RNA sequence: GCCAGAACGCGAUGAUACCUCCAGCACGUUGUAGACGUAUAAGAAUAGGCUCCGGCCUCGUAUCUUAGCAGGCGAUUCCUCCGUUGGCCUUGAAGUGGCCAGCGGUAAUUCGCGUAUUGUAAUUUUAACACGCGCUGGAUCAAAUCCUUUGCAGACGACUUAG
RNA sequence: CAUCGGUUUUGGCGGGGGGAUAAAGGUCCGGGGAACGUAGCUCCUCCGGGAGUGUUAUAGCCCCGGGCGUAAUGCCCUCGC
């Protein structure tokens, strides 16, 4: 029997919306990627697909797990945090939640 | 400080057992009925384990006291239960002192001496809802005052725009918990002597 | 004895001291400019350990146990290179534990997907032998 | 900013009364040539009555250090305006180039005497040929017999993104 | 997560791959080139006929009878594979597996699956 | 990165540790700080004491039972006041971020057997310049009304005594494992194969 | 200005053992052993040449260099203490009321206790407990004189100052009431 | 020392009827400030430390674990690793870990058989808690309140009593 | 997903021009100097140094000129991918 995991994605945390102190723009989200600590490393993940996986209370299409899809657009700041844009603005209660960063379309 | 464990001796009198009910007259008096099996079963190994715990771990030991209100001319039958701290030697000594005292009456003679200075703790005499002059001893107002004499005139300045906690207000007086200290004993009389 | 005291004798900053600059290069100290800056010259044939002559802040360098003996102050390139070769600094650095640790990091970063799998397989086989040895030691203890 | 050294030659515009006027050379430490020409007219106005409107810039080119790899001692004379008067001072620096010494002074004079670029005039910058020309204590201690010192304390360099460390770092690097 | 061998790039980002069915159970299959990682390990194709690489890279080969066989009216049973495709995979595997087995760990390396452990940073990992 | 981070509070500066911890809590990281009686504050202890006395004099005038500031005196609560001032605690997001933090005096179980992490950005041995003065939050708490300086002190001696005994067992295992590796009969070919792989 | 090197040296007699674990200085001599802690000053110790201990500070700002000479004298005082000891003489000064003094070594603690009665008309009793390791005697050679002896200068000097500070006059012109116990010469035992 | 006691702070103890409680198993959730290896215990100094006493110390860029239908069925082969049940000992800071018995499963090495068709990407629906339903094996047969009464108390509640 | 169009962001590559046609720098050939004075030598200690003489010797350094050399690098400005 196998004694290993099955993870094919990098782990990330939804930090916050794009904002300027007293104004926030839910259209864009800030995502922290575990292990990414500078802009030269955040360039690898540009364009990769990001998925926020949460649970609903009703069973639709034979499941309770729901997904919101997105992608990494550009680096943010100097510390490797990146801006991500999703199909719908990502929920505000999920600040600090965990997102999956797939290795989808790959240039390597 | 945290209470680690409690050990109860068997054969508790009804005076103790009434303290654990509000309707003792119609109850089944099941208090400590399943507990006495600890003293009996396995030669009281359950009680022995608890005593070993107190000696090894605890740093403060107290006994659970019990009054004999049936010996007083009071209509009450509930006894007042209490914790008394065993000040003295080592923790091992305190446990053997308390354990030997189980179910054994303790007289006031041993605890206190004739010329000892003690502190007396009780709840004072209740007076009900009383006014400002009785609660705080403020000066009474002149007899010309329109809306009452036994009052405080100014209950605060304009600012702070609140009535403060330091201003005398009517309310409850008496029935407060107090600890009166520095009381000298003059005599410890005997209940059997005819010349007390 | 008479006096028994410990020792915290650091590595001195001196003309001839070999520094390790950022990136992995080496450079001796040819003249001290300030208490925070030195003039260095890394005349090493190997491009990895070669450093151009210039001033570097001491806060960005790491002092090494290797010292170029009796190097004259302010010696130019060539004169430093002659002393660098005479002292055999390049050879001594190779056996240094810092180089071995640095080389080990480079080898691990260069591993590919196949190599990482092979590293797994060869580590598991090696671990099995050590597990047998340790169990025998404990049982026979 | 980071300063270059320019030589700027100026001249009054020739007129009928003065067909051939005099040439005025000057060495200026400036971040760029635009400022260097601005500094030239500022110094020439007070000195030789010449104004930019009635003058022309003959040339403005960079003087580069001849030996940027030799450690040399510099002595600088300046005048500056404090908050209550004007004072002349003399300082000494140990750098590689005359420009490097001048950048040091502007930071040194701002740190210690709170002076700014707009308050300092660089009168003269010279290279001390020997060691008995040094007249300051902070510079004499760097040219001793065999300078060799350790680096006590010297906290290590740890990545600011590595928030947590498993073991306590040792300050013996 | 599986590891497969690239046969031919067809068009519009579509790749024809097969991780030998007797190694990791990946049949002849089309995969878009954006959803793969191209490693530095190359398997020599000396022995695989390019003639049979064609006529299966030619389209409609995979979805020829999808519409014909879509029965879902009901003890479920596996959709039996067309005997033509079973023979086609068997023919290709003969040369491919023989070349693969000549490398000490390549046979086991292909049989395994790829996963990310703790501390593995894909932006830093070489392939 | 991790699941739960246990931070050894000894030797860290109160403010610099609090800011780092505050940001991690908002990002969604659960943090446990132990040995908060050993936290440091820069400057002479007299200034630290005077700063707390000015804090003690601020209290609601008309009713001290309501409205705070409710001056807490334990070292774990002095630190928690520093962190709470760095959180938007009046919102549901800031309220949840504070629920991720547990602060203790000493090292209570089960944290007595978990790895203790340090924050180099806040270590006073790295930050403060030599020759400058500093104090300890434990000493400041003691002289403002804390009651368990000695109870915690005795419990830590027991923990170190228990921890000390665990160390020889660890040393023996390390000594035995070194012997096993040297005495292991391993294939020669795989020896350099792993060596050229960096392992 | 920061100084790249400040240095002090201290001669160690051949009959004295000096130990410095980290910065805690232990001096062992004929008269006993003394321990001093100096972990509050950043200093480096070294052996220079056959019985001399070097003290150096590497980057000081004239406030650390000042502490360099202080440490040298403190360490030199430890060496003197275990070889020749310290002896303080104190004389009694009064105008009308003789000062009655009794000294006795406490059995439970071990420290000498100086008890002063009959200050200027005073009925109160001034009890002063000496620092550990200090011996108190009443001199027989000269009348009205105390003698304090010990290896530690801090212990001896602080003990002598405690006696002097407790004998202070109150609410009187101190230029007229020059009464108290005042420290005489501060030589050594040997 | 003394007064109050958080009515959303906590501990010990006694008895707990029922639509009950304890343990195990099984299934499910209109549950989750948000699992995916969610692995890692000396103490202490930092102008000094660790040690297997041989030596070592910027560096956690480390160590363990890491292959197999989300991981099958057999074979060859090695006594490693993991989980669980029972017994003994031990841990009180908000009680947790250690030796031994049995049972169960296991690539250090080498193979054979099965995967396909989810059709070119669509979360990888699987963990841990909490709760509910049910079954099995045991355990138990209680109080409080209203009411009448008391006056050490009381505006009314409340409180001290007694039935 | 592939191939395009518009806008934009971030990297990399090749080639030109300019300044003292960079200044430096390496090697060689010349001239002139000194010390934080290398060898040798003269003194006290001589475990370890200090003092003097001594201008390259059994290290070297500074200044000026000239070949290799139309050297390289660097900065700025540019033509493209
Ligand atoms: Mg009226
Ligand atoms: Mg385009
Ligand atoms: Mg050029």
Swiss-Prot record, chain B:
Record localization: Cytoplasm
Major localization class: cytoplasm
A GO cellular component annotation in the UniProt record: cytosolic large ribosomal subunit
GO biological process: translation
Source taxon at top rank: Eukaryota
Keywords: Cytoplasm, Ribonucleoprotein, Ribosomal protein
Keyword Oxidoreductase in record: no
Molecular-function GO terms, alphabetical: RNA binding; structural constituent of ribosome
Function: Component of the ribosome, a large ribonucleoprotein complex responsible for the synthesis of proteins in the cell. The small ribosomal subunit (SSU) binds messenger RNAs (mRNAs) and translates the encoded message by selecting cognate aminoacyl-transfer RNA (tRNA) molecules. The large subunit (LSU) contains the ribosomal catalytic site termed the peptidyl transferase center (PTC), which catalyzes the formation of peptide bonds, thereby polymerizing the amino acids delivered by tRNAs into a polypeptide chain.
Family: Belongs to the universal ribosomal protein uL3 family.
Subunit-level organization: Component of the large ribosomal subunit (LSU). Mature N.crassa ribosomes consist of a small (40S) and a large (60S) subunit. The 40S small subunit contains 1 molecule of ribosomal RNA (18S rRNA) and at least 32 different proteins. The large 60S subunit contains 3 rRNA molecules (26S, 5.8S and 5S rRNA) and at least 42 different proteins.
Protein name per Swiss-Prot or TrEMBL: Large ribosomal subunit protein uL3
Whole sequence portion shown: 99 to 294 of 392
């Amino acid at each position: 029997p196998t004694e290993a995991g099955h993870r094919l994605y990098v782990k990330g945390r939804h930090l916050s919306y794009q904002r300027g102190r007293h104004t926030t723009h839910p259209k864009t989200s800030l995502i922290k990627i575990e292990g990414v600590d500078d802009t030269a490393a955040a360039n690898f993940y540009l364009g990769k697909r990001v998925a926020y996986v949460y649970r609903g209370q009703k069973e639709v299409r034979g499941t309770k797990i729901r997904v919101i899809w997105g992608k990494v657009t550009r680096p943010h700041g100097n510390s490797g945090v990146v801006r991500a844009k999703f199909a719908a603005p990502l929920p505000s209660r999920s600040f600090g939640a965990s997102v999956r960063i797939m290795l989808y379309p790959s240039s390597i | 400080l945290r209470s680690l464990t409690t050990v109860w001796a068997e054969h508790l009198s009804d005076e103790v057992k009434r303290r654990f009910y509000k309707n003792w007259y119609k109850s089944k008096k099941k208090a400590f009925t399943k507990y006495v099996k600890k003293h009996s079963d396995n030669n009281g190994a359950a009680i022995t384990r608890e005593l070993e715990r107190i000696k090894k771990y605890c740093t403060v030991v107290r006994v659970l006291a019990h009054t004999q209100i049936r010996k007083t001319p009071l209509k009450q039958k509930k006894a007042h239960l209490m914790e008394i701290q065993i000040n003295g030697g080592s923790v091992a000594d305190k446990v053997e002192f308390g354990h030997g005292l189980f179910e054994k009456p303790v007289s006031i003679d041993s605890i206190f001496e004739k010329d000892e200075v003690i502190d007396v703790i009780a709840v004072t005499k209740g007076h009900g809802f009383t006014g400002v002059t009785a609660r705080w001893g403020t000066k009474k107002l002149p007899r010309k005052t329109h809306k009452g004499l036994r009052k405080v005139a100014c209950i605060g300045a304009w600012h702070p725009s609140h009535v403060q906690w330091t201003v005398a207000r009517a309310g409850q007086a008496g029935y407060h918990h107090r600890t009166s200290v520095n009381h000298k004993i003059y005599r410890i009389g005997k209940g059997d002597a005819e010349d007390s | 004895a008479d006096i028994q005291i410990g020792s915290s004798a650091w590595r001195l900053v001196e003309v001839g001291r070999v520094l390790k600059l950022e990136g992995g290069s080496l450079a001796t100290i040819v003249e001290i400019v300030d208490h925070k800056r030195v003039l260095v010259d890394g005349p090493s044939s190997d491009p990895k350990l070669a450093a151009p002559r210039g001033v570097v802040s001491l806060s960005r360098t790491l002092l090494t146990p290797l010292v170029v003996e009796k190097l004259p102050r302010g010696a130019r390139t060539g004169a430093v290179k002659k002393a660098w070769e005479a002292a055999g600094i390049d050879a001594k650095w190779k056996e240094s534990n810092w180089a071995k640790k640095q080389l080990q990091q480079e080898r691990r970063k260069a591993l590919t997907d196949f190599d990482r799998f092979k590293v797994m397989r060869l580590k598991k086989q090696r671990r099995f032998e050590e597990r047998k040895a340790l169990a025998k030691i404990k049982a026979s203890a | 900013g980071r300063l270059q050294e320019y030589q700027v030659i100026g001249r009054h515009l020739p007129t009928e009364s003065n067909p051939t006027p005099a040439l005025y050379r000057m060495r200026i430490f400036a971040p760029n040539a635009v400022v260097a020409k601005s500094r030239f007219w500022y110094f020439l106005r007070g000195l030789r009555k010449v104004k930019k409107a009635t003058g022309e810039i003959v040339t403005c080119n960079v003087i580069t250090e001849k030996h940027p790899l030799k450690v040399k001692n510099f002595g600088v004379w300046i005048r500056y305006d404090s908050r209550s008067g004007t004072h002349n001072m003399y300082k000494e620096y140990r750098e590689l180039s005359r420009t490097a010494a001048v950048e040091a002074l502007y930071s040194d004079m701002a740190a210690r005497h709170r002076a700014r670029f707009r308050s300092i005039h660089i009168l003269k910058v010279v290279e001390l040929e020997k060691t008995e020309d040094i007249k300051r204590p902070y510079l004499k201690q760097l040219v001793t017999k065999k300078l060799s010192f350790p680096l006590p304390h010297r906290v290590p360099k740890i990545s600011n993104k590595k928030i947590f460390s498993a073991k306590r770092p040792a300050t013996f690097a | 997560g599986k590891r497969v061998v690239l046969l031919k790039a067809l068009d519009q980002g579509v790749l024809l791959v097969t991780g030998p069915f007797k190694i990791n159970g990946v049949p002849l299959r089309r995969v878009n080139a954006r959803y793969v990682i191209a490693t530095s390990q190359k398997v020599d194709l000396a022995g695989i006929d390019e003639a049979k690489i064609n006529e299966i890279a030619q389209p409609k080969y995979f979805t020829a009878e999808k519409s014909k066989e879509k029965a879902g009216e009901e003890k479920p049973q596996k959709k039996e594979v067309s005997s033509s495709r079973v023979a086609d995979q068997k023919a290709i595997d003969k040369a491919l597996i023989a070349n693969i087995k000549k490398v000490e760990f390549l046979a086991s390396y292909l049989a395994s699956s790829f996963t990310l452990r703790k501390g593995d940073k894909p932006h830093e990992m070489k392939w | 990165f991790e699941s739960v981070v246990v931070i050894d509070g000894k030797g860290h500066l109160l403010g610099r540790l609090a800011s780092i911890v505050a940001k991690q809590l908002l990002n969604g990281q659960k943090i446990v700080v132990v040995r908060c009686e050993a936290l440091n504050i820069s400057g002479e202890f007299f200034r630290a004491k005077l700063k707390y006395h000015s804090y003690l004099r601020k209290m609601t005038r008309y009713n001290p039972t309501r409205g705070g500031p409710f001056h807490f005196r334990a070292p774990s609560r002095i630190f928690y006041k520093a962190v709470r001032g760095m959180i938007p605690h009046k919102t549901a997001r800031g309220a949840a971020a504070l629920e991720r933090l547990k602060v203790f005096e000493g090292v209570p179980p089960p944290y007595d057997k978990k790895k203790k992490m340090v924050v180099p950005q806040a270590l006073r041995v790295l930050r403060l310049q030599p020759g400058r003065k500093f104090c300890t939050v434990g000493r400041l708490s003691s002289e403002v009304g804390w009651k368990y300086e000695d109870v915690v002190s005795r419990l830590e001696e027991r923990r170190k005594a228990k921890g000390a005994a665990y160390y020889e067992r660890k040393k023996v295992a390390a000594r035995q494992l070194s012997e096993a590796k040297k005495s292991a009969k391993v294939n020669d070919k795989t020896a350099e194969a792993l060596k050229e792989f960096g392992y | 200005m920061r100084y790249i090197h400040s240095e002090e040296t201290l001669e160690v007699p051949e009959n004295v053992k000096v130990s410095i674990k980290s910065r805690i200085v232990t001096v062992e001599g004929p008269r006993g052993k003394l321990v001093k802690d100096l972990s509050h000053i950043a200093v480096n110790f070294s052996v220079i040449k056959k019985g001399v201990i070097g003290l150096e500070i590497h980057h000081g700002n004239r406030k650390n260099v000042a502490a360099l000479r202080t440490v040298r004298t403190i360490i030199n005082n430890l060496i003197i203490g275990v070889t020749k000891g310290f002896k303080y003489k104190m004389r009694y000064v009064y105008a009308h009321f003789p000062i009655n003094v009794n000294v006795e070594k406490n059995a439970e603690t071990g420290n000498f206790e100086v008890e002063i009665r009959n200050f200027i008309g005073e009925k109160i009793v001034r009890r002063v407990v000496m620092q550990p390791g200090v011996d108190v005697e009443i001199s027989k050679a000269q009348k009205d004189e105390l003698v304090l002896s010990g290896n530690s200068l801090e212990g001896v000097s602080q003990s002598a100052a405690d006696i002097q500070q407790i004998c202070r006059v109150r609410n009187k012109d101190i230029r007229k009431f020059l009464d108290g116990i005042y420290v005489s010469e501060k030589g050594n035992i040997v």
